[PDB]
């Protein structure tokens, strides 16, 4: 079978980004030893090791949706993947408010129409299980108390 490739964006500190950029544009396999990525079983934490120097990483959710588009003639472009995550290196914390481009900054706060967390469904599933495992349930919409 075929599995859709999973592309994400890696953001590095600027000096480390310059060393990684120089090693990528060089093209040797020396970069392979120099740059490693360890993703922790949290799923939202990691180390990126540039030249064997550890950097602390967080995999965050991006507010917009990006799409990689490949081409052979620079006139027709074929969509290859959807990018929604970024492993910035240096829950609410795992959500990035800004977009990658310069015009998109504070997009989630200003350029996004109010949208719901769809979280609440999981909380309702937790309450329903407790109700069904009980015997007697008493409910009242309340006031200030």
């Amino acid at each position: 079978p075929h599995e859709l490739e999973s592309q994400f964006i890696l953001r590095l500190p600027p000096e480390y980004a310059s060393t990684v950029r120089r090693a990528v544009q060089s093209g040797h396999v020396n970069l392979k030893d120099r740059l490693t990525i360890e993703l922790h079983p949290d799923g939202r934490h990691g180390i990126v090791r540039v030249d064997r120097v550890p950097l602390a990483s967080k995999l965050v959710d991006l507010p917009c949706v990006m799409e990689s588009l490949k081409t052979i003639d620079k006139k027709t472009f074929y969509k290859t993947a959807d990018i929604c995550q970024m492993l910035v290196s240096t829950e609410k914390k795992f959500i990035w408010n800004h977009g990658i481009t310069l015009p998109l900054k504070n997009v989630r706060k200003r350029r996004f129409r109010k949208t719901a967390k769809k979280d609440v469904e999981k909380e309702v599933k937790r309450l329903l299980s407790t109700d069904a495992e009980a015997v007697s349930t008493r409910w009242e919409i309340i006031a200030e108390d």
């Binding site: 800004h98 310069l102 015009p103 900054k105 504070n106 706060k109 200003r110 609440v120 469904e121 909380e123 309702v124 309450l127 329903l128 407790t130 109700d131 495992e133 009980a134 015997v135 007697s136 349930t137 008493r138 409910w139 009242e140 919409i141 309340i142 006031a143």
Partner: protein, 82 residues
């Protein structure tokens, strides 16, 4: 009392103005600085049996109007499933 050219031209100019606003903001390379109706909560009492013999009762209060809506919507639907 125009019911024709006035409405059409007004819509057209708002379209060009909106479009003009849209192109400029997006192509900007300028850096941007980082920046219920009833007022009623929901409380639930739960009765359960502990290991050996016990009958403890739990009173739990949900102050989130979002959890409220989804909870009671299901309860109202169930009141009508029978």
């Amino acid at each position: 009392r125009f019911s024709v050219a006035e409405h059409q031209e007004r819509y057209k100019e708002e379209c060009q103005r909106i479009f003009d606003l849209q192109n400029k903001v997006l192509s900007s390379t300028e850096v941007l600085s980082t920046d219920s109706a009833t007022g009623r909560c929901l409380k639930i009492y739960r009765t359960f049996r502990d290991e050996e013999g016990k009958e403890y009762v739990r009173c739990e209060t949900v102050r989130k109007p979002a959890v409220i809506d989804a909870y009671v919507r299901i309860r109202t639907t169930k009141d009508e499933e029978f």
